[PDB]
Amino acid sequence: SADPDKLIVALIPDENAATVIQDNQGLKDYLTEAFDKEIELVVTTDYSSMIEAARNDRLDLAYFGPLSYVLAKAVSDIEPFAARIKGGTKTYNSCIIGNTKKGVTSFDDIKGTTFALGDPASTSSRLFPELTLAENGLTKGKDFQGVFLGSHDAVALAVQNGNAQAGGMACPILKSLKKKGVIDPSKVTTIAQSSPIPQYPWTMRSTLSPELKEKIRFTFLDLDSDKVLKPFNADGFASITDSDYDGIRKAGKLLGLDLSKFVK
């Protein structure tokens, strides 16, 4: 297990498993030839199942969300090493959205609604949107009710068809879904965009040999292929460290997030 013939490679389920698996097929191939190893992709049922797999050393690489990374890191020996970069920027934003037809175009209009959230351990579809609503005088459980719909796709669709009159999701996923014709820009209004969040970290199991780790780090950081990178809307991968995610630790402490809800 310090240098196995097969690498288990886990991907956070931020969208439908089918989409996540298809988008990563280019990378799967590249890594297979770069390493001379069998590559198995895993897409779990939710973010917490992925944290528990990290915890029991079942993963070798793991593409986490920022909050899910901070959670897994506390109970696992994984370590960060790369993140997507695009026109010099290594960050993304959370979007607050509203149902256009019902006139939900401002924070005041969220009062008395169902507000759509993603997975409970999501950075841009749970943590950041709840903080943002609170900073505009709306407290969950008294001014509105949240509902956990599991993924960012599901949040976007719920707001568009009015099952929820507002919600919170990652801005790159919203942009992607409009490009594909899934989300109609006339039906969903962007009410706000948060400050920058650090990108999703690629991580690796810590008990892998020094030589393999450097090879993994190099391969990602040196990567330049359009087959691999085009489904990601990225120019490459840039280096990152654990302290890039202290902002996220601060935000989670402030909201009152509970590691025991997500692990054990």
216 CB contacts (<8 Å, ≥6 apart)? 35, 61, 81, 204, 208
With tokens 């899910």, the residue in question is 68
CA proximity to 249, closest of 39, 43, 26, 67: 67
Report the amino acid identity of residue 165. Answer: Q
* Residue 228 burial (CB count, 10 A): 20
Output the six-digit token pair for 152. Answer: 């960012």
Cα 66 from Cα 245, distance rounded (Å): 7
Pairing of strands 38-43, 145-148: unpaired
- Tell me if 53 sits within 8 A of 203, measured CB to CB: no
Q: Which two tokens stand for residue 198?
A: 């650090």
- β-strand pairing of 114-117 with 145-148: parallel
Distance CA(23)–CA(172), nearest Å, equals 14
d(CA 1, CA 113): 50
Q: What is the resolution of this structure in A?
A: 2.1
Q: Is 87 exposed, middle or buried (0-12, 13-18, 19+ CB in 10 A)?
A: exposed
Start-to-end CA span in the chain (Å): 25
166 close to 109: Cβ distance less than 8 angstroms: yes
Full 3-state SS string of 163-213: CCCEEEEEHHHHHHHHHCCCCCCCCEEEEEECCCEECCCEEEECCCCHHHH
